[PDB]
Symmetry: D3
Subunit: 266 residues, 6 copies
């Protein structure tokens, strides 16, 4: 539908792919079709061994993602609501599990599923003028795209509760103050400052061992959700996977030869 663009950058950004939501007519809302294409694009990247970092952003200035489509929802029977919402929770969850580092570039409004999708990314950067929040309670529903789990985990229980309870919408500076995002930018004339920073942060990842980066992610994500001792065992298991890699040795042969390693993900 062209509503979702999957670009593979080059040159200086080689190794970076970008997922851009282009559906201004719907405020980039999650229509039953946009999640299909999203779910489709996500599975594709799951196995894409070339990718080293993934940026998720919008190509519609002023808007990141307004969440689920109110229009379609009001035309859904109760027995259909649950299934559709769970579909969104699952795609958002697959995104949280992408193999490489993920960065959400919020240059605009990010509500409900929009922020939940961003919460699924490893890192979030946003313009100070961007607005985000989970307003589900004002509609007598609750965040249904993982938000009740990821928000408390990212900023703490007390603040995640207050935001969800008051269904308050924060701006870039506020989100930054509560830790919702790790970098607050000054919006530029093209309305893509968050994206530029994300790209910049991404390049910063490109020079590392592809295999080490992926298992580092796995150790962090998996370990945080089990007791520390099991987490340590998981760290050992991920570390073991970097040992028989050419890259491990290429790393050593690069510093001994005083030269930038040329990792291949092997």
């Amino acid at each position: 539908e062209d509503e979702l663009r999957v670009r593979h950058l080059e040159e200086e950004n080689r190794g970076i792919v970008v997922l851009g939501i282009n559906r201004a007519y719907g405020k980039n809302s999650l229509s039953k079709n946009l999640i299909k294409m999203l779910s489709k694009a996500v599975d594709a990247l799951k196995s894409d061994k070339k990718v080293r970092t993934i940026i998720i952003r919008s190509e519609v200035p002023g808007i990141f993602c307004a969440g689920a489509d109110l229009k379609e929802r009001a035309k859904m029977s109760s027995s259909e609501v649950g299934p559709f919402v769970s579909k969104i929770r699952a795609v958002i969850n697959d995104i949280a599990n992408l193999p490489v580092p993920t960065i959400a570039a919020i240059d605009g409004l990010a509500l409900g599923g929009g922020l939940e999708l961003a919460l699924a990314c490893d890192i979030r950067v946003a313009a100070s003028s961007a607005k985000m929040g989970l307003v589900e309670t004002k509609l007598a529903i609750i965040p249904g795209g993982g938000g009740t789990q990821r928000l408390p985990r990212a900023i703490g229980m007390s603040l995640a509760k207050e935001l969800i309870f008051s269904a308050r919408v924060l701006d870039g500076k506020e989100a930054k103050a509560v830790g919702l995002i790790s970098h607050v930018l000054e919006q530029n004339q093209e309305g893509d400052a968050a994206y530029r920073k994300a790209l910049d942060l991404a390049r910063e990842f490109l020079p590392q061992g592809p295999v080490a980066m992926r298992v580092a992610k796995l150790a962090i994500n998996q370990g945080m959700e089990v007791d520390l001792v099991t987490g340590l065992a998981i760290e050992e298991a991920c570390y073991a996977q970097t040992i028989p890699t050419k890259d491990r040795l290429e790393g050593l042969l690069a510093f001994k030869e005083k030269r930038p390693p040329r990792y291949k993900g092997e």
Copy 2:
């Protein structure tokens, strides 16, 4: 009268205030207060109209100083553990209250007092309020859930330092370590935190009663298990809002550009 339960009205309709009023014992958690607190909390657990609860003190300069140190000295060792466990228990029921809860700290909050506040979803305190867990200074440990809720609320390292040092912080410091989410200058009446709490609670009033409750359950429950199980819980909680009249009124209210009229169901 050592425990006041007020159902506010008009603009504050839906807000219930639990006020500790034991000036004589510095609002210490005596056997009696603990009993009345438990009755109060259980009754509210089943109250259908409440949309937010505020826990505060009706004695200026004092939130709650903790367990009655006098009664403790009059308990045999075999009675200590059971008693302290009753404190840990009631404080845990407060943490599980169905609706949003706000602790208004306008005075001293020590031991069980601070733990009581920790059981609340949100904490608001005056700058001049003093709070801390000084159990280690008495050769014991926080026993009202503090060893669990303090590290969870501000991180392990800071929680450990505070407990190991038995340090007491003022409102400003509490805000700085994230022990509370709102801090402000005490006012002439000595109820600044309470006034602020009231304003914050009003912000919760307009939301769907059913969704607010299951939202609380998904957060409290989900945070204590792996994320995947958490998502399943979020799914089971969301599912309960679908067949509610409220959910429909929300979509209707949105379509008729007007304020939603929620009644729970």
Copy 3:
């Protein structure tokens, strides 16, 4: 060997034991020998009945611990690397489980296993000019001393990922900002300002009931890795161990006679 010195301070500071890494020629790297001595000291302190607080520091200005020695590593068989790194992970984990309060005085560089050792301590104090990070990914490996677990738990998942993915090194001032350390200050002329602070902090711990302090640490460490309900049960079981102590009585007595308590452990 004087590579790992164990000082048992006394009078005014009695109860405080200082563990000093002194391997200037190797930047306090975790050589095979060091971990062996470290493990012996840790295990010794484990059962020491007079300790009340342990401070871990370097006696080498500008260097806390550079992490795993890159020399010895480049000389290991792929089947040896794993077990070596695991020994580091294990000892660092024994430090995490020391029975009493532990403080890390970071007056110098803390990289890889060095920062991981500091993470294993209960509290971290550092100089603003001190550097620290986990740059493993740059070498196509991941943190192996527990970093993938403790870093995310201490400063949050997103920031921990950003630091590990980019392999960024922070200074004390930045570490404070992200909550990596609890106390930051300006290095003094002696180059031991973190240490002075650590010492001052440890002294705040001395007056408290020794038994209560140990089970408080047990309740917290253990409770943070399980559900809150079980954590409450743990707190109860830990509290129970303070009820039949002489110190608990002394405490209620001191309070009565309005005087300073005199604790002896039991």
Copy 4:
């Protein structure tokens, strides 16, 4: 009134407390009034210090507990059902947490809440002609008293799913075969064979250290629901509570003096 009987036995049964359900007119179903009494009797029994073992049984021949009273349920508006069922669940869980060993004597029908009640007990004894099961699915609902959790834990997930999915009722012998009960025996002329076997089993628990017995239950119940390593720290904290008991020393003293021990709790 006498719908719930609490008896404090003596002579050779001193220490055994019997809780008998006596509501024949309603098949001992869990009516609003019966759950209240049960909750009161349960709450009081926790703080009870002389109790050494509790037996839950029925004063009515051929019937243990039919579960919830379908009469009241039909008169309950949808908004009242969930809260009432969670109350049955909570009380049954309190039964699961009683301090001393618990034994369910099943001399009759045990359906739904009745069986869930028996599952909250540490040990289940039943007449071979006793019938028991969770038939909620035949009513388009699910076990609501902890059955979805306790049945799978007690006899395994596969067998638990089959019983709940088919809403099958088993007899005492098939219950023993699937491990639902520990002891099964031929019913006697009195119709209280299970109860008699429970008393004998109970008497086997009396001669043991009361404190050790209690913390042992805590250690078993709590450690089973968390990772094993945390479970080991829980065992540690529980063992500690027996160390400063006079009973521990009595045990050692009784062994030396080759004579039966005389414990008193403390």
Copy 5:
């Protein structure tokens, strides 16, 4: 034709059968069979009429021998992990199917085949059927969920012994160790397990569909978290059956003393 998905009728209406038809390679989990399997499994997740699913083999004497050994020798080290994980993931989706699942083992079930059976809620096998995880004999380990579901199904001790020894058991032994819940003597047609499966399936058909699904969720999810969280999960699952027409029918039927007639809703 390698994967037949049937929607039975008559007395079996509501039962869906997924049959593996690849005698060519002992129903081995080839790249194609896996893609087809995943497509069908995903399709069944949204199938709103199915009330129970049975997984079986349409090839007498063989259930599924596991991953295709021929294809494996052609994969690079970098291709193995991904492929094995795909299998582990598809087997996990089967384990998460909304309705009751029954594995009918009338033949050989090795590695992925036995792991596939472990993903089903219930297993029935002919006494002459052989099954096991022999990965260790090939210097690898069960990679389809076996190291997790086997210990959970039969216990740690027995699972390690089977995996350490890479031993193959027959239906009778599988019954003895609790690996299967139902064992029967095989028949000429070679489909005795499938026949028993259908009969068991029919036992499930009359129950409330919504209650059946949330019961399965409560059991699967609660089992992998602490008991208390598990009770909260049960509460949330039970709540979803409260506002259903089926639940009122259940009560109406009991009062009219007739068999209830459920429709999901």
Copy 6:
């Protein structure tokens, strides 16, 4: 010399036997025996050639009666806990040994003795051998990890009954409740369990040593967390066998129709 650690050979190569030779105390867990046991276990953790470990007593009719009472009665309150923890810690180190472990029970196995056995992967015992946890009869509770390993091994209800009644079971009863995986009639030499253990041990030897090690890790670690994390752990362990020469050998062996010859790596 109270603990012999021998590395067998000729058909038994790869098997190491751990023998408790301390009859003057019923093989009780003395400070000294614990020190030695801990040293052996820690040494075995790096022994690159071992493929299976057997723990048994070289004293007829006795496995291990647990901690030594004589020493205990000489320890002050402050020393018991630390010592008991030391027992729990070493027994836990045994549960974590890298290779399959079999406990050969040919005699009395009480307290720490049975607990040590519970730490092994598999338990074999003579029908006449006796074992149990009688701590509660001494006013204490199992302190070697029994409160945790027993319930997990035979179920909560049974472990509670055994611990509460401080009952002693014989090999036959141990088999019936699942406490042990194999029971034999004792032989004239009084080492029937040992011979069984050796035979069972020899069945492990041919398998890929790397795969065996990571198989145990997947099983032990996966069983203590949620299934999903467990599947992730299995993936990480599976991944380690991919770049091994043993895996390739396994496939080549099959192809050339000949028994595989693994050397680890």
